Amino acid sequence: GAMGSMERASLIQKAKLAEQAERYEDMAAFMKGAVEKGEELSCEERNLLSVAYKNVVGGQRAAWRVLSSIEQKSNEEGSEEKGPEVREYREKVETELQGVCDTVLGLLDSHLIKEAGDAESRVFYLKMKGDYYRYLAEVATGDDKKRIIDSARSAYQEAMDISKKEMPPTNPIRLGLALNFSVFHYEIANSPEEAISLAKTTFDEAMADLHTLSEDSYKDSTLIMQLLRDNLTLWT
Amino acid sequence: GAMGSMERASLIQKAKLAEQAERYEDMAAFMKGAVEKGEELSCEERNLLSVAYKNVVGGQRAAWRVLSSIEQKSNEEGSEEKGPEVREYREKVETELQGVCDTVLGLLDSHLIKEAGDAESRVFYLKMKGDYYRYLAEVATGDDKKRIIDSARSAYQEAMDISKKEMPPTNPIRLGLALNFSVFHYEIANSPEEAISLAKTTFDEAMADLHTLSEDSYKDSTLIMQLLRDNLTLWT
Amino acid sequence: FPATV
Amino acid sequence: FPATV
Numbered sequence: 450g451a452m453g454s455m456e457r458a459s460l461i462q463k464a465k466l467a468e469q470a471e472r473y474e475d476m477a478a479f480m481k482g483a484v485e486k487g488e489e490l491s492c493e494e495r496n497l498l499s500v501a502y503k504n505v506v507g508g509q510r511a512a513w514r515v516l517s518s519i520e521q522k523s524n525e526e527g528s529e530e531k532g533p534e535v536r537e538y539r540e541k542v543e544t545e546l547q548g549v550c551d552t553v554l555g556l557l558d559s560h561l562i563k564e565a566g567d568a569e570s571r572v573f574y575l576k577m578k579g580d581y582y583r584y585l586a587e588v589a590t591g592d593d594k595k596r597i598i599d600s601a602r603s604a605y606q607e608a609m610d611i612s613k614k615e616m617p618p619t620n621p622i623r624l625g626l627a628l629n630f631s632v633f634h635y636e637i638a639n640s641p642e643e644a645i646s647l648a649k650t651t652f653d654e655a656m657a658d659l660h661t662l663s664e665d666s667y668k669d670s671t672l673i674m675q676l677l678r679d680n681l682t683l684w685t
Numbered sequence: 686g687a688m689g690s691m692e693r694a695s696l697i698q699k700a701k702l703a704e705q706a707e708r709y710e711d712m713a714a715f716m717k718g719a720v721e722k723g724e725e726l727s728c729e730e731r732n733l734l735s736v737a738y739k740n741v742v743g744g745q746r747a748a749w750r751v752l753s754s755i756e757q758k759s760n761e762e763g764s765e766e767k768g769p770e771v772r773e774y775r776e777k778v779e780t781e782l783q784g785v786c787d788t789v790l791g792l793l794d795s796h797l798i799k800e801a802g803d804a805e806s807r808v809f810y811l812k813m814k815g816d817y818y819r820y821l822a823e824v825a826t827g828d829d830k831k832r833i834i835d836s837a838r839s840a841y842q843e844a845m846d847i848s849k850k851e852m853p854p855t856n857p858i859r860l861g862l863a864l865n866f867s868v869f870h871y872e873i874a875n876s877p878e879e880a881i882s883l884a885k886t887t888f889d890e891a892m893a894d895l896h897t898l899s900e901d902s903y904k905d906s907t908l909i910m911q912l913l914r915d916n917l918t919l920w921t
Numbered sequence: 922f923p924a925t926v
Numbered sequence: 927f928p929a930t931v
């Protein structure tokens with residue numbers, strides 16, 4: 450790997466520089482190199498890993514959506530045939546996106562999840578696993594769509610089970626997991642009632658736990674609670 | 686070249702899709718492939734080429750500035766030594782930026798400029814040549830800084846001479862050339878009086894030509910006139 | 922689109 | 927920074 454000759458601490462330092470410069474591809478490459486040193490990640494390092502890949506795939510998803518929209522318009526009644534280029538370029542972006550998802554899932558499977566025993570690491574990585582299968586599901590249309598959806602659900606469910614046993618309701622990782630699993634239900638799994646139920650139960654239980662939330666996690670958790678409320682407002 | 690097997694028209698079509706998806710690296714690669722087909726570019730195609738590379742290098746410049754700022758702070762009195770990583774990563778971004786500039790300059794030199802005879806193409810490409818040497822100048826500190834600055838000036842000057850002879854004062858390419866050459870004077874060449882004089886003369890002459898400006902070019906030209914005024918307000 | 926984190 | 931186009 451191209452990062453094999455760089456010190457772990459230098460990779461972490463450069464991932465932080467890349468974040469400041471909004472160079473998310475570089476950030477992800479640095480964090481992949483750090484993971485490949487074979488040591489567990491600290492809490493701050495997990496956050497750098499997640500932010501890097503979330504931003505890379507986020508841009509790919511935005512571009513894929515633009516191109517898929519064009520492609521669907523091109524396949525409507527009365528649209529002029531303009532050849533294979535829209536499909537080809539959508540496929541190009543899609544394959545790149547799938548490659549990034551596969552890279553993240555490979556890091557999680559070797560060997561971040563196996564070695565994560567504390568709830569704050571295990572839930573975090575399982576959430577990421579669900580998220581990256583969800584992004585694969587967004588673009589999947591072949592015979593593997595159902596398996597991809599099942600893999601996302603299984604990861605989210607294991608994370609949910611651990612989070613309810615081991616974390617308080619206002620823990621930001623627990624809240625963010627529930628936010629995203631609720632979106633999975635609504636947008637991926639054709640289960641809007643489950644999505645709404647999860648968002649509402651999560652929000653209500655977090656409210657009753659606010660009297661215990663730390664001032665340090667308050668911004669993160671209240672933001673995620675607001676996102677739960679935003680989704681509920683969109684869905685009801 | 687990786688685009689050698691794709692039809693010219695397909696490259697142009699995909700550059701337009703990439704622009705819509707804000708995939709500027711892809712856009713630039715498609716337009717480089719189109720240029721390498723060996724035919725002159727139309728006016729719309731020139732614009733796609735310019736927008737693609739302007740956005741690629743624009744992001745690199747923004748990241749370089751963030752990292753150079755960190756680097757300079759790290760070299761101040763009382764700053765703790767944190768090793769080679771900031772310099773290394775700034776150098777990495779810088780080398781990538783230089784590579785993109787070199788690629789654009791190579792396309793212009795082979796063979797866009799040689800074959801451009803109409804003013805609207807020749808001035809456009811010479812402006813681009815000045816711009817990409819200017820971006821090289823922004824990061825240059827070695828013995829080549831002066832030569833790079835001279836190359837930018839020579840390109841901008843040839844473009845200026847053609848533009849004043851062959852285009853009306855409110856032509857957007859003429860206006861944009863003058864805007865950028867004025868910035869070159871102020872920020873690169875340590876010639877603020879020349880920068881101010883050029884911006885003022887350009888603005889005043891364009892005002893007196895507005896009664897001839899087409900409704901189609903009105904938005905572009907009035908925007909650039911506003912940018913000239915903005916710079917003059919910053920500089921005086 | 923709905924919000925995720 | 928000053929504006930360019």
Ligand SMILES: C=CC(C)(C)OC[C@H]1O[C@H](O[C@@H]2C3=C([C@H](C)CN4CCCCC4)C[C@H](O)[C@]3(C)/C=C3/[C@@H](COC)CC[C@@]3(C)C[C@H]2O)[C@H](O)[C@@H](O)[C@@H]1O
Pocket residue numbers: 468493496497499500503573574576577621622625626668669672926
């Ligand atoms: C920039 C520096 C680095 C080192 C990269 O840290 C980024 C952020 O990492 C922490 O935050 C975390 C995360 C986010 C919160 C919601 C952002 N937060 C919102 C309110 C204001 C302050 C910032 C989003 C990220 O995607 C980030 C890392 C991601 C997650 C999700 C990860 O699933 C795998 C689960 C929930 C959340 C939000 C945990 C949350 O704890 C700090 O606590 C923040 O201070 C800090 O900005």
Ligand SMILES: C=CC(C)(C)OC[C@H]1O[C@H](O[C@@H]2C3=C([C@H](C)CN4CCCCC4)C[C@H](O)[C@]3(C)/C=C3/[C@@H](COC)CC[C@@]3(C)C[C@H]2O)[C@H](O)[C@@H](O)[C@@H]1O
Pocket residue numbers: 704729732733735736739809810812813857858861862904905908931
């Ligand atoms: C998106 C579709 C594509 C095919 C890529 O076209 C982009 C734009 O190309 C034209 O515009 C041109 C350029 C810009 C003008 C200023 C933008 N304009 C501002 C007011 C509102 C409408 C948009 C910026 C570009 O960087 C663009 C292409 C660049 C330049 C400079 C290029 O030096 C080498 C010289 C001046 C200018 C501004 C010429 C200007 O003619 C159209 O006329 C616009 O409609 C259109 O959006």
Ligand SMILES: [Mg+2]
Pocket residue numbers: 456457
């Ligand atoms: Mg070591």
Ligand SMILES: [Mg+2]
Pocket residue numbers: 540543544
């Ligand atoms: Mg595919």
Ligand SMILES: [Mg+2]
Pocket residue numbers: none
């Ligand atoms: Mg339940």
Ligand SMILES: [Mg+2]
Pocket residue numbers: 692693
């Ligand atoms: Mg052909």
Ligand SMILES: [Mg+2]
Pocket residue numbers: 776779780
């Ligand atoms: Mg250098």
Ligand SMILES: [Mg+2]
Pocket residue numbers: none
């Ligand atoms: Mg003069």
